[PDB]
């Protein structure tokens, strides 16, 4: 037992120089080579399992069921059950034996090749073939691609074909005019360090029509992935990158060959888009000639995944940014489908799975809108649309009459002196105001006020019976919605500017339409769904329902009055119930103040759809109610 019990330390500690990769560490304790000692050398050893374990993509080596025994005066007999994996799968229920040996004052491992594969003996081979996995497709709630693996135009240039002086420059001009493209890029990419003369150097995946081709150009057609949307969808869709060896190392399964999703959906589901590679693990003896299968099944290519997106209102709702900073959500609010989540501005996403230079990447990332940004997805105070809200729970706890009007003078005001300078500030001087008024014309100082009658527990009672610090269930990466940082305000002015939506309110564009929701189901919340096959899940009694059939009324009058915040919609001619909002923050790096303006709008006779857009930091005399007719017409017709 004295020696025994060091026998299983040695081959425990084999397995985990094995398992870390460390074959010199793994080699250094074997026995001499000689007959019934180790069959190699300490280097022969080493380069025994990083040649075959390397080939295989060996990871996470890992034995069970060890015993350990005795044959001989210093010879220890040891097996036990190992698994593996490999870049074909995991290799389960593998019998391991060999012998020991206790020499000196340590015991080493007479190490034999059934000790890298069991059945291995002598100088066989280990062989392995695979076949890649073609990538699934992404695709909308009618089967439009979003992301796909289609035939693409690459232009290039040979150099050798190109000239030799003048005639070289003429056509690399000629090349650089007729596909848009810069003549310092073309003599830059010719000019590279991997560059041959006979070589094609490849310059730009080009769309569409192909004009003529100068001398040097041709045009290949190569697969690869392809977006297209394009931009307007890039935040959410993702791009797909190289694989490198670190992918690899954290997973074998992956294909060295292949693609990985980096960001967006195409890296949720990467492991469902990119399917399982086939081929064969397999022994062969001295000469090629197969011995054991190890591991084989044939490739299976990556299943689709179909989401709940309108490929027409995605692009419309992301053209309507114009390039401004913003997003817009789109749902049909009695199911929860999301039909649109464009976020602006936002980056080529064909360019970055193609070829885009350090230059180009660095301008996106440099961008002080940052168009990598999923906006969707990032947690904003809501902005004085968050009235409703307020008001849904003033009118179910009783604390606000409809018909009460409450006498403001000014477009400032505070609860007391101990407020100091600040005040709640609106927009319209209206001496006479009530619920339907206050909707009307965006009346923060009504909000404020009727938030600190009804006083913070009750507020606060009302605001828990939504989805804040909720994770919903969705295939994006985003933070719950927060109603401010600790569970208490201890504060007057934070409780007074959350009733109207910006104090410490986190809440992200989807988290809002979710919220919102209630509006369209008669103070049911529908969980918001991107996976169309998914099932509908709903919260039921979040307000009351005599509250929506109060509040919905006076959000028709934000459109149809002469002096609603969203009248310019009621050109539209169509059934419409909105709320305007904005929201101010302090910036600090101009620390002028930056604005933030937020439209609300659905359809309250059939709640077909519903949406919610917002224009971050916007320009002067802009707003998200100036860019939404088109997105409206559009859900309006086509989701009743």
Same mark, same amino acid.
């Given at each position: ?484 940082? *600790?569970? /208490? &305000? ?8 959350? =009733? #109207?939506?910006?104090?410490?309110? %986190?809440? !992200? ?85 930056? *604005?933030? /303006? &937020? ?8 709640? =077909? #759809?519903?949406?919610?857009?917002? %224009?971050? !930091? ?23």
């Amino acid at each position: 037992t004295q020696a025994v019990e060091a026998g299983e330390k040695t081959v425990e500690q084999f397995v985990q120089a094995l398992n870390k990769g460390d074959y010199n560490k793994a080699a250094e304790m074997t026995s001499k080579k000689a007959a019934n000692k180790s069959a190699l050398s300490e280097k022969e050893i080493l380069d025994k399992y990083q040649n075959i374990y390397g080939a295989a993509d060996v990871k996470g080596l890992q034995i069970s069921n060890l015993k350990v025994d005795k044959k001989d005066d210093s010879t220890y007999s040891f097996s036990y059950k190992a698994k593996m994996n490999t870049s074909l799968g995991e290799l389960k229920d593998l019998s391991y034996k060999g012998t020991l040996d206790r020499n000196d004052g340590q015991t080493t491992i007479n190490w034999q090749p059934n000790l890298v594969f069991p059945e291995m003996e002598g100088n066989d081979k280990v062989s392995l073939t695979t076949q890649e996995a073609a990538r699934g497709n992404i695709i909308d709630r009618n089967g439009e691609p979003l992301a796909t693996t289609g035939k693409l135009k690459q232009l290039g240039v040979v150099p050798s074909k190109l000239g030799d002086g003048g005639e070289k420059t003429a056509n690399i001009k000629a090349i650089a005019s007729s596909f848009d493209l810069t003549e310092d890029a073309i003599n830059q990419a010719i000019s590279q360090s991997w560059v041959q003369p006979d070589y094609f150097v490849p310059l730009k995946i080009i769309d569409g029509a192909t004009p003529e081709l100068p001398a040097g150009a041709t045009i290949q057609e190569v697969d690869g992935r392809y977006y297209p949307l394009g931009e307007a969808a890039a935040q959410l869709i993702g791009y797909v990158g190289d694989i490198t060896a670190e992918d690899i190392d954290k997973n074998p399964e992956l294909s060295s060959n292949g693609k990985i999703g980096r960001s967006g959906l195409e890296m949720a589901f990467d492991k469902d888009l990119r399917g399982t590679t086939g081929g064969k693990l397999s022994i062969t003896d001295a000469d090629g000639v197969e011995k054991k299968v190890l591991i084989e099944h044939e490739v299976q290519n990556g299943k689709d995944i179909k989401l709940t997106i309108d490929a027409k209102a995605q692009k419309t709702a992301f053209d309507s940014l114009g390039g401004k900073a913003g997003s817009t959500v789109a749902t049909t609010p009695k199911t929860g489908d999301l039909l649109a989540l464009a976020s602006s501005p936002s980056y080529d996403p064909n360019k970055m799975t193609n070829g885009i230079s350090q230059e180009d990447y660095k301008a996106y990332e440099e961008n002080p809108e940052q168009p990598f940004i999923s906006r969707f997805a990032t947690g904003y105070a809501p902005g004085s649309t968050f009235k409703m809200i307020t008001a849904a729970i003033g009118l179910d706890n009783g604390t606000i009459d409809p018909n009460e009007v409450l006498t403001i003078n000014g477009l400032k005001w505070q609860k007391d002196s101990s407020w100091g300078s600040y005040q709640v500030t609106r927009v319209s001087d209206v001496s006479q105001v009530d619920l339907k008024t206050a909707l009307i014309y965006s009346d923060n100082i009504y909000a404020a006020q009727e938030t600190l009658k009804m006083g913070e527990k009750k507020f606060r009672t009302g605001l828990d019976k939504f989805i804040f610090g909720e994770d919903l269930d969705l295939p994006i990466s985003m933070n719950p919605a927060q109603i401010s940082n *600790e569970d /208490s &305000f201890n504060s007057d002015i934070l409780l007074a500017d959350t =009733g #109207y939506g910006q104090g410490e309110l %986190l809440i !992200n564009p989807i988290q809002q339409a979710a919220m919102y929701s209630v509006f369209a189901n008669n103070g049911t919340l529908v969980y918001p769904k991107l996976i169309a096959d998914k099932e509908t899940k709903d919260k039921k009694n979040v307000i009351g329902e005599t509250a929506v059939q109060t509040i919905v009324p006076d959000l028709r009058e934000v459109v149809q009055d002469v002096n609603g915040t969203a009248h310019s919609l009621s050109a539209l001619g169509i059934p419409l119930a909105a709320k305007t909002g904005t929201a101010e923050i302090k910036e600090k790096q101009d620390v002028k103040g930056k *604005e933030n /303006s &937020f439209l609300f709008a659905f359809n309250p006779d059939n709640q =077909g #759809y519903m949406m919610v857009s917002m %224009l971050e !930091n916007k320009e002067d005399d802009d707003s998200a109610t100036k860019r939404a007719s088109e997105l409206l017409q559009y859900l309006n017709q086509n989701y009743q």
